[PDB]
Design an enzyme around this catalytic site. Structure first.
Site, mmCIF file in Angstrom:
data_model
loop_
_atom_site.group_PDB
_atom_site.id
_atom_site.type_symbol
_atom_site.label_atom_id
_atom_site.label_comp_id
_atom_site.label_asym_id
_atom_site.label_seq_id
_atom_site.Cartn_x
_atom_site.Cartn_y
_atom_site.Cartn_z
ATOM 1 N N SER B 38 0.828 -1.215 0.000
ATOM 2 C CA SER B 38 0.000 0.000 0.000
ATOM 3 C C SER B 38 0.874 1.282 0.000
ATOM 4 O O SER B 38 0.457 2.357 -0.465
ATOM 5 C CB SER B 38 -0.843 0.018 1.265
ATOM 6 N N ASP B 153 -8.210 3.465 -3.395
ATOM 7 C CA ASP B 153 -9.398 3.225 -4.201
ATOM 8 C C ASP B 153 -10.490 2.405 -3.518
ATOM 9 O O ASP B 153 -11.685 2.808 -3.609
ATOM 10 C CB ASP B 153 -9.068 2.740 -5.650
ATOM 11 N N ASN B 183 -4.922 1.643 -7.362
ATOM 12 C CA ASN B 183 -4.029 0.499 -7.513
ATOM 13 C C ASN B 183 -4.788 -0.813 -7.712
ATOM 14 O O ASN B 183 -4.234 -1.883 -7.563
ATOM 15 C CB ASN B 183 -3.004 0.479 -6.356
ATOM 16 N N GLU B 364 -23.658 14.301 8.460
ATOM 17 C CA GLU B 364 -23.143 14.436 9.822
ATOM 18 C C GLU B 364 -21.712 13.947 9.905
ATOM 19 O O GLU B 364 -20.912 14.541 10.620
ATOM 20 C CB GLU B 364 -23.978 13.685 10.868
ATOM 21 N N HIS B 414 -32.664 17.932 20.972
ATOM 22 C CA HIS B 414 -33.735 16.975 20.843
ATOM 23 C C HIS B 414 -33.459 15.666 21.543
ATOM 24 O O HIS B 414 -33.754 14.560 20.998
ATOM 25 C CB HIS B 414 -34.093 16.770 19.333
HETATM 26 C C1 LIG Z 1 -29.728 11.557 9.335
HETATM 27 C C2 LIG Z 1 -30.626 12.724 9.551
HETATM 28 N N1 LIG Z 1 -30.131 14.016 9.693
HETATM 29 C C3 LIG Z 1 -30.950 15.115 9.827
HETATM 30 C C4 LIG Z 1 -32.348 14.951 9.890
HETATM 31 C C5 LIG Z 1 -33.200 16.209 10.115
HETATM 32 N N2 LIG Z 1 -34.150 16.332 9.010
HETATM 33 C C6 LIG Z 1 -35.382 15.696 8.829
HETATM 34 S S1 LIG Z 1 -36.129 16.024 7.410
HETATM 35 C C7 LIG Z 1 -34.826 16.950 6.977
HETATM 36 C C8 LIG Z 1 -34.801 17.681 5.653
HETATM 37 C C9 LIG Z 1 -34.953 16.619 4.567
HETATM 38 O O1 LIG Z 1 -34.984 17.317 3.329
HETATM 39 P P1 LIG Z 1 -35.265 16.492 1.993
HETATM 40 O O2 LIG Z 1 -34.439 15.272 1.966
HETATM 41 O O3 LIG Z 1 -35.005 17.343 0.800
HETATM 42 O O4 LIG Z 1 -36.822 16.018 2.069
HETATM 43 P P2 LIG Z 1 -38.128 16.891 1.687
HETATM 44 O O5 LIG Z 1 -38.883 17.089 2.990
HETATM 45 O O6 LIG Z 1 -37.791 18.202 1.016
HETATM 46 O O7 LIG Z 1 -38.920 16.020 0.725
HETATM 47 C C10 LIG Z 1 -33.819 17.033 7.920
HETATM 48 C C11 LIG Z 1 -32.549 17.843 7.839
HETATM 49 C C12 LIG Z 1 -32.834 13.601 9.764
HETATM 50 N N3 LIG Z 1 -34.159 13.252 9.835
HETATM 51 N N4 LIG Z 1 -31.982 12.537 9.582
HETATM 52 C C1 LIG Z 2 -13.543 2.478 7.962
HETATM 53 C C2 LIG Z 2 -12.645 1.309 7.755
HETATM 54 N N1 LIG Z 2 -13.132 0.071 7.350
HETATM 55 C C3 LIG Z 2 -12.309 -1.002 7.089
HETATM 56 C C4 LIG Z 2 -10.920 -0.892 7.291
HETATM 57 C C5 LIG Z 2 -10.066 -2.148 7.054
HETATM 58 N N2 LIG Z 2 -9.054 -1.839 6.045
HETATM 59 C C6 LIG Z 2 -7.822 -1.197 6.199
HETATM 60 S S1 LIG Z 2 -6.991 -0.951 4.809
HETATM 61 C C7 LIG Z 2 -8.256 -1.619 3.975
HETATM 62 C C8 LIG Z 2 -8.197 -1.771 2.471
HETATM 63 C C9 LIG Z 2 -7.996 -0.371 1.899
HETATM 64 O O1 LIG Z 2 -7.886 -0.528 0.490
HETATM 65 P P1 LIG Z 2 -7.539 0.750 -0.398
HETATM 66 O O2 LIG Z 2 -8.375 1.893 0.009
HETATM 67 O O3 LIG Z 2 -7.720 0.438 -1.841
HETATM 68 O O4 LIG Z 2 -5.994 1.138 -0.053
HETATM 69 P P2 LIG Z 2 -4.659 0.470 -0.672
HETATM 70 O O5 LIG Z 2 -3.976 -0.231 0.491
HETATM 71 O O6 LIG Z 2 -4.941 -0.469 -1.820
HETATM 72 O O7 LIG Z 2 -3.822 1.639 -1.169
HETATM 73 C C10 LIG Z 2 -9.314 -2.053 4.751
HETATM 74 C C11 LIG Z 2 -10.568 -2.752 4.286
HETATM 75 C C12 LIG Z 2 -10.443 0.394 7.732
HETATM 76 N N3 LIG Z 2 -9.128 0.672 8.010
HETATM 77 N N4 LIG Z 2 -11.295 1.453 7.933
HETATM 78 CA CA LIG Z 3 -6.321 -0.009 -3.412
#
Ligand SMILES: Cc1ncc(C[n+]2csc(CCOP(=O)(O)OP(=O)(O)O)c2C)c(N)n1
Ligand SMILES: Cc1ncc(C[n+]2csc(CCOP(=O)(O)OP(=O)(O)O)c2C)c(N)n1
Ligand SMILES: [Ca+2]
Ligand SMILES: [Ca+2]
Ligand code: NA
Ligand code: NA
Lengths: 616, 616
Positions: B38, B153, B183, B364, B414
């Site tokens: 890597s 990748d 790669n 988030e 909330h």
């Molecule tokens: C993971 C997450 N983050 C934030 C919220 C807060 N929230 C609820 S509805 C909403 C807006 C959603 O907008 P959209 O996807 O465009 O739906 P629309 O009501 O316009 O159809 C947000 C920010 C949530 N429910 N879930």
């Molecule tokens: C969020 C998360 N999930 C899984 C792993 C386990 N893990 C570490 S390296 C790796 C493979 C990464 O492959 P790539 O992004 O292609 O990097 P390369 O080594 O080929 O350059 C994985 C699955 C991790 N480190 N982090």
């Molecule tokens: Ca790779």
């Protein structure tokens, strides 16, 4: 075979869309909360999916032959409720009880509703669940049902969505349709791309989807778009206006999640009703019945574990072995892993049962949502795996899985400092906290190969969110093959009559405690050693009985942070019991790289720490 | 102004790339673990970025004028170490101590290393941090430094990455360059797109990036690609082979995270060394010094809170007010919110200080990584907000933020069932568990407007991961404006001499406990009421003293699940203290929609539950 609708059927679909608008308004005004504008952009989509495109049994929403619908933008729940009243399943008067403590018409959809499979109030999760259902329908059920998922446009900002988009194209889910409600606005401002429909199309096509731009308020365009099958997952990119059909509110900011006041509800409703040509409802059309039956029975290992007391195996390896073994007892077992199969040993299951292994790639959020979707209607029994540390990446999917009343199994490897040299990014030290806080969870922490195999079996047959914590060091087998194990039952693994303290360890710290016992007997100090097996539920009765036999003294020792792990569960279980004390040894800060044994000592949870602490 | 390299400089960059390969091999063979393959795909990228493209002080890696480099694919840490030895900062012999407990050359990069800003062992996080640094450089520092982020990748499968790609184009980060090490292979199989370079380009361009496909082992193509600035974020899509330069291992599966055995290391190293034309190292070139100085002083509110005892305000509103107020005392304060500003009240800060508000949209994970990147080198003091429930979506970013030793502030609104009608998808019931398990955390749970303002101030000046739990009900102000508050100091808010039990509540349950006290005095039962202020650290001394005054009896009551919250923290704090008992009231399962007061009663944490329980 597409039924090309006539004018009358078109007009009927518009009437339905307008009834759906009225009901979303009446329900949310009656509640005094909810999201009528988020309902109104989707009214034609919902009318066309439910009353032209989809095939389902209107009196049996859970029926395994039905097309599936996932409302990913779950805050539009009132219009989901309205279509199920329109279809005849729900009583129309019940819609007015939206959000009441006396109603199951809750603020966002939840599986106490027969017509809901997965909970979707946390945005960006419904498409991954839909991919689970479509993968199951295409590859496991091998059925003709299709899967439709309705997303918001603000919602497409969640990276989980793009994990699902990529999964659907990798796995050629040409029975999956995502409908994007491009109503220009999110909660608190316009969505980033607003009505740049070309950029949504480019993003979808880049991710491997057939992407069709439509007028989302044209029932005919929607019919036609939904009417042609593809060889790819299909994205219907619907240009709509938020609050469509509410004069003065359509296409305006400051209205997300705001109900119409009574006086305004009445006036708007009257204008909408004036547009409706006939009261007569469209009937749903039932599905071709080709889903297979699925056996509900207990799943038993085909033999007992074949480890011998004293052999050395890491519990991450025992898990791979056990899961492959269990794959031979039941066809419902499926395994999922996020490009870590060679480290979790789920590759063992892939080798033996390739058709039932799903490679999810580096995408833990989507992996959990796929498992949730695979488990809906009890079609499969999924086991997901990755390093336990990276289940923190999926915590909102896991949390929503419990709100979805989902029966999924998760095995996270590489727990604690005892992994050694990779360092803390790979060390799970908060996973017991995380999974204990999931309300339907059972938390298994097996200390050897035998316990691991038994945990796999029990988990398979246990409802709720089952977690199995596996480890990297190769510790001894300490249990006989025929030892019985049950959820909530611990094991005393070393004892006498003259025991000074009950030491509670698990995985690597159990074997550190047994090694401490060996150092301690040298000075004529006996210690009772207790292996909890499950952290949740905890065997309180056994822990208390052991403590009373060891002069009330409990020592807990864990390869986990102090908060929400074994020591706090034990403290919470025993607090206020006369004569009982509890000393807690755990990891006190972010760790660092070194050998497994060096880290266990640096962080005060190895044999010498345990031995040094008992003497106190 | 691009310096177009000559043949000699090109040859020197290839020599450097080959030295970097050798060092990555020697270090990982010496350790017996690590990821030389890597490292080897990225060797030319690293040589060209460090020894042609970037500008930095080689003896002062943290210098605020330096270009930033983020190794998102953190498992390539040995080659990061190798470039800092090549640049003269690290001693070359130290590279061999990779992964030793006596070394800070740990398995993945961590900020104890002067040359590392953010920890990146959990994949898919480094680009969001890099966006934080680039946003800061362009909009806050208004400096000439650039930001370079190297991704794997397989890693591009993480949806967090695509949140960052979208953020960079929304915010026109034309000082940001992502380099994609294509790669072909991930950990346990090829990456999904393998060497389909056109599809990577299409995905990047669809997301708003200028995308250039290069031979990733061509030092000249890399120079040229890095040499032209753009008006967009730029993605250098580098076609490479995993294990490049290791004969027999290049482009092979089964080699991820596997070191070369000693005998093979020696033979390979000799072949690589035979390719190197000169021993002479390239020197780094220093940066234009245009970053501004940043004041390090304590930040004080410009006045005391202006609430009156008895006024009603929700703590989510008090937080918006306090944060805007604090924005006027210091220019370092920045706010970030994920399309929830109207519900968290961070919109108040946006109104007063628009240039310092960053809308992060529904994403988030990325929001937390942007805050981490904004806080690096102490450039800003960030406060992120969303519903506390949706901080679970970012738990791996938060967990890695503590491993990054990051000083960020998070306010989640909330909390609990007391939000009422939206139902459990929006109810934070595991956030105290989650944040308590973060090892550098301070957990503030303010019970009224005054406590909220004070928490905001204290958090601003407190290192580590500061969390503030806000609530939706509008409860009374109960504290005088001039009440002093400190981390780890609780408050007794009702007491007598004749108190039967010390009741511990927080936010809505504090006010439920005071209302229970009112029901209870009717029957001549007095209760001491205690408001913890911080859940972590907990005021053990005060809780114990209160319990001894109330016949040892403690009752904890919380709008949170039983595991890892207030009741367990209190249990763990007091367990084994003679005469002390602890009754715990909490939420026992997934909730449902209803009125705030109806839910508090259904779930056994309202005034009547508290009153009913004290009588027992
Ligand atoms: C993971 C997450 N983050 C934030 C919220 C807060 N929230 C609820 S509805 C909403 C807006 C959603 O907008 P959209 O996807 O465009 O739906 P629309 O009501 O316009 O159809 C947000 C920010 C949530 N429910 N879930
Ligand atoms: C969020 C998360 N999930 C899984 C792993 C386990 N893990 C570490 S390296 C790796 C493979 C990464 O492959 P790539 O992004 O292609 O990097 P390369 O080594 O080929 O350059 C994985 C699955 C991790 N480190 N982090
Ligand atoms: Ca790779
Ligand atoms: Ca929208
Ligand atoms: Na199970
Ligand atoms: Na802080």
């Amino acid at each position: 075979s597409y039924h090309k609708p006539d004018q009358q059927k078109l007009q009927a679909l518009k009437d339905t869309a307008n009834r759906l608008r009225i009901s979303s308004i009446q329900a949310t005004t009656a509640a005094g909360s909810g999201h009528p504008t988020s309902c109104c952009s989707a009214a034609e989509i919902m009318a066309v999916l439910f009353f032209h495109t989809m095939r389902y049994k209107s009196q049996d929403p859970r029926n395994p032959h039905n097309d599936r619908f996932v409302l990913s933008k779950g805050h539009a729940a009132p219009i989901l409720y309205a279509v199920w009243a329109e279809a005849g399943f729900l009583a129309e008067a019940e819609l007015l009880n939206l959000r009441k403590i006396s109603s199951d018409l809750d603020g966002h959809p939840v599986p106490k509703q027969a017509f809901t499979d997965v909970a979707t109030g946390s945005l960006g999760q419904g498409l991954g669940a839909a991919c689970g259902m479509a993968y199951t329908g295409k590859y496991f059920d091998k059925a003709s049902y299709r899967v439709y998922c309705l997303l918001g446009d603000g919602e497409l900002s969640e990276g989980s969505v793009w994990e699902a988009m990529a999964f659907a194209s990798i796995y050629k889910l040409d029975n999956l349709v995502a409908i994007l409600d491009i109503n220009r606005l999110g909660q608190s401002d316009p969505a980033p791309l607003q009505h740049q429909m070309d950029i949504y199309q480019k993003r979808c096509e880049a991710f491997g989807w057939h992407a069709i731009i439509v007028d989302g308020h044209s029932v005919e365009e929607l019919c036609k778009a939904f009417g042609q099958a593809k060889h790819q997952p299909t994205a219907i990119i619907a240009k709509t206006f938020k609050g469509r059909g509410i004069t003065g509110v359509e296409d305006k900011e400051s209205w997300h999640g705001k109900p119409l006041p009574k006086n305004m509800a009445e006036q708007i409703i009257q204008e909408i009703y004036s547009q409706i040509q006939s009261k007569k409802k469209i009937l749903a059309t039932p599905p071709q019945e080709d889903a297979p039956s699925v056996d509900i029975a207990n799943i038993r290992m085909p033999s007992l574990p074949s480890y011998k007391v004293g052999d050395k195996i890491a519990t991450r390896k025992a898990y791979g072995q056990a899961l492959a073994k269990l794959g031979h007892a039941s066809d419902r077992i499926i395994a999922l892993d996020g490009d870590t199969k060679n480290s979790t040993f789920s590759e063992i299951f892939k080798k033996e049962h390739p058709d039932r292994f799903i490679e999810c790639y580096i995408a833990e959020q989507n992996m959990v949502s796929i498992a949730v979707g695979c488990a809906t209607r009890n079609r499969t029994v999924p086991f997901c795996s990755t390093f336990a540390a990276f289940f923190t990446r999926a915590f909102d999917q896991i949390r929503m899985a419990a709100i979805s009343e989902s029966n999924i199994n998760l095995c996270g490897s590489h727990c604690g400092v005892s992994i050694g040299e990779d360092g803390p990014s790979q060390m799970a030290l908060e996973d017991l906290a995380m999974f204990r806080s999931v309300p339907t969870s059972t938390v298994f922490y097996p200390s050897d190969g035998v316990a691991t195999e038994k945990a796999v079996e029990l988990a398979a047959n246990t409802k709720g969110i089952c977690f199995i914590r596996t480890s990297r060091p190769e510790n001894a087998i300490i249990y006989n093959n025929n030892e019985d194990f049950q959820v909530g039952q611990a094991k005393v693994v070393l004892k006498s009559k003259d025991d000074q303290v009950t030491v509670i360890g698990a995985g690597v710290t159990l074997h550190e405690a047994l090694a401490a016992a060996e150092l301690l007997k040298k000075e004529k100090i006996n210690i009772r050693v207790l292996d909890p097996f499950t952290i949740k539920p905890l065997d309180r009765k056994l822990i208390l009985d052991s403590a009373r036999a060891t002069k009330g003294r409990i020592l807990t020792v864990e390869d986990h942070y102090y908060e929400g792990g074994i020591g706090e569960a034990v403290s919470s279980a025993v607090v206020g019991e006369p004569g009982i004390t509890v000393t807690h040894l755990a990891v006190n800060r972010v760790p660092r790289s070194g050998k497994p044994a060096e880290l266990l000592k640096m962080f005060g949870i190895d044999r010498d720490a345990i031995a040094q602490a008992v003497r106190g």
